[PDB]
Amino acid sequence: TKAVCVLKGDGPVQGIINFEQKESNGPVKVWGSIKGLTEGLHGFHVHEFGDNTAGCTSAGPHFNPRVGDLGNVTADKDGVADVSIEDSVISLSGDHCIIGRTLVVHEKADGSRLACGVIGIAQ
Amino acid sequence: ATKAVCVLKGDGPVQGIINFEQKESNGPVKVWGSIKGLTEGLHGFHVHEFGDNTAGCTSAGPHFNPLSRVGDLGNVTADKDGVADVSIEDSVISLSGDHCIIGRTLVVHEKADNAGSRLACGVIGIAQ
Ligand SMILES: [Zn+2]
Ligand SMILES: [Zn+2]
């Protein structure tokens, strides 16, 4: 099972995040990159709703049937954060399924929602 | 999920918000909302297989139609102001199960449904 998310915001923050889960009860691999960030730590969360009608504001609270807390990503001096996470709480199926929800990258370490996108099914 | 929502955006002026509701599991899905920035007339309105916007609408993949068409919601009609008001009931798509469209892509096309180019699209997200 595979998913993807394109992060976009009001400013320079943008990225593409990939998800892969080999077995329904196994870890989800999350990888990709985010650009346009301030150097240092940024909160990285799945929020409850895949509702982008008001940009990141409409995504609702953190997903927590917290399940949606993926930790922090770290941006380098050029503002680029590499994402390489293995997470065994989120899922691409069942009750912890994050497909159709919103991925958000935050201004501060685990602030304002800098960029987000709806998590979609990928090839 | 009993409700979904999709924000349509493209490289041009076509934009809209489409809502989906399925209050009963395996029941009909109501689809409604508005799309603007269209040329007057009919435009193909389809669910495509992948919720992949990495290359805009070009990465949405084929018309959704699992071999295991489903994704064909028909045409929307734009008026002289370029606005298409949408109100459809579809009992083939679903917000769960084999025909689930959550996390897939909704696309509005250039021509009536070959529906031609993909004017705008968005990933279908959980709304409730
Ligand atoms: Zn958050
Ligand atoms: Zn199509």
Side-chain angles (χ1 to χ4, degrees):
Chain A
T1 305
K2 294 180 185 184
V4 69
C5 184
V6 180
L7 299 167
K8 296 185 186 298
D10 291 347
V13 181
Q14 62 195 0
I16 296 174
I17 302 299
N18 303 285
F19 301 84
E20 185 178 339
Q21 190 179 28
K22 297 207 168 186
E23 301 181 5
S24 71
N25 81 324
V28 178
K29 184 65 179 57
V30 187
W31 79 101
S33 63
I34 307 173
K35 302 182 174 296
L37 294 165
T38 56
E39 183 178 1
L41 293 171
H42 295 271
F44 194 49
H45 302 149
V46 180
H47 289 240
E48 187 173 1
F49 308 117
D51 183 329
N52 186 64
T53 58
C56 304
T57 311
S58 42
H62 296 199
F63 180 54
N64 196 29
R66 292 179 175 177
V67 172
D69 300 339
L70 298 184
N72 287 314
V73 298
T74 303
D76 66 16
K77 62 177 179 174
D78 285 343
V80 179
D82 179 53
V83 178
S84 185
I85 297 177
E86 196 159 320
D87 191 287
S88 59
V89 182
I90 60 168
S91 192
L92 302 183
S93 64
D95 56 323
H96 290 187
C97 181
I98 62 174
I99 292 175
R101 305 197 188 265
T102 294
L103 185 64
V104 177
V105 58
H106 286 267
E107 174 197 352
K108 303 188 185 310
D110 255 317
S112 181
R113 302 177 186 187
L114 300 179
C116 66
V118 179
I119 300 165
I121 297 167
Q123 202 167 18
Chain B
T2 60
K3 290 202 60 172
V5 67
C6 181
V7 177
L8 300 168
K9 286 175 193 169
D11 293 342
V14 180
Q15 57 184 322
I17 295 169
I18 300 294
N19 305 286
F20 300 81
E21 184 164 13
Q22 189 184 35
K23 285 187 53 179
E24 296 97 16
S25 293
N26 307 312
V29 179
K30 295 180 189 178
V31 185
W32 77 96
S34 190
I35 307 170
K36 65 188 180 192
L38 293 162
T39 57
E40 176 178 5
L42 294 175
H43 295 270
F45 193 48
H46 300 161
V47 181
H48 285 242
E49 187 175 8
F50 302 117
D52 182 337
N53 192 49
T54 59
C57 303
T58 77
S59 43
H63 203 125
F64 181 51
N65 197 40
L67 294 187
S68 68
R69 290 179 278 191
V70 170
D72 188 2
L73 302 177
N75 288 311
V76 298
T77 303
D79 63 19
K80 65 171 188 292
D81 283 314
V83 178
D85 288 320
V86 180
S87 180
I88 306 181
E89 176 178 331
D90 193 284
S91 59
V92 176
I93 57 165
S94 188
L95 301 184
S96 76
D98 279 339
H99 293 171
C100 185
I101 62 174
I102 300 295
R104 304 194 188 270
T105 291
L106 184 64
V107 175
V108 58
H109 283 272
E110 168 195 10
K111 301 183 188 297
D113 118 84
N114 172 44
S117 84
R118 304 171 184 179
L119 300 178
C121 67
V123 182
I124 300 165
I126 295 170
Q128 178 192 355

